Homo-oligomer: A and B are copies of this chain.
Amino acid sequence: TTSAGEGADPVTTDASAHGGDTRTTRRAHTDVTFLLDRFTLVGKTNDNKLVLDLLSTKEKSLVGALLRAATYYFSDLEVACVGTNAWVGWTPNGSPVLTEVGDNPVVFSRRGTTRFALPYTAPHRVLATVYNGDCKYKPIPTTFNYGMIYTQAEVDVYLRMKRAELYCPRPVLTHYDHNGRDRYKTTLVKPA
């Protein structure tokens, strides 16, 4: 179909012009909520502390990449610290940094991992993955966090976004290197 592309109005076509059909599609796997609803490893704690910042997610992982594909987002959160450690503790967004959690929420370990559920605690209606605040581009606020955890020992930290909502899509780039080759190619799983 010819069209006046300048106006930017969407155009989506079948194969019917050429005599074709349309297959039945089931896009369950491209559902945003489903996609982000899994645990992603963000790394290890530091002095047995870790600020819960979704921007800590590895940017080439499925979750890190998708989260960054949106300008704004909202979600609740689940945490799981795996490692040999006794107890993970937590403080909400806006609390002063402490020397010891003592009395704030504390959860004891069970068979080497501590997993628990948290609520969105920011003071904003939604958070952003980018924020052009005083950083004049020429050709992230304190508040953007989900609290902080305190642990008894070093552990691997995993975050899981629950009830996720994304707004204003942003680019998602391929991360494999073509080298000089035209096609990309790798070894895919095959019977040995």
Contact = CB atoms under 8 A, between A and B. Distances in A.
Given A103-B61, A103-B63, A55 B189 contact: no
A91 interface: yes
A41 B97 contact: no
Contacts of A180: none
Given A41-B102, A41-B103, A103-B62, A97 B187 contact: yes
B189 A97 contact: yes
A174 interface: no
A188 interface: yes
Nearest to A55: B191
B96 A186 contact: yes
A142 to B, nearest CB: 4
A187 B191 CA distance: 39
B191 A51 contact: yes
A190 interface: yes
A148 interface: yes
Interface string A27-57: 0000000000010110000000001010100
**Which of the four size classes fits the interface of chain A?**
20 to 34
A96 B188 contact: yes
Interface in A124-159: 140, 142, 144-145, 147-148
A11 to B, nearest CB: 29
Contact of A191 (B53, B91, B95, B188): B53
A140 B191 contact: yes
Interface in A164-189: 186-189
A190 B186 CA distance: 41
A107 B51 CA distance: 26
8 contacts: A41-B103, A51-B192, A53-B191, A62-B103, A63-B103, A96-B186, A96-B188, A147-B189
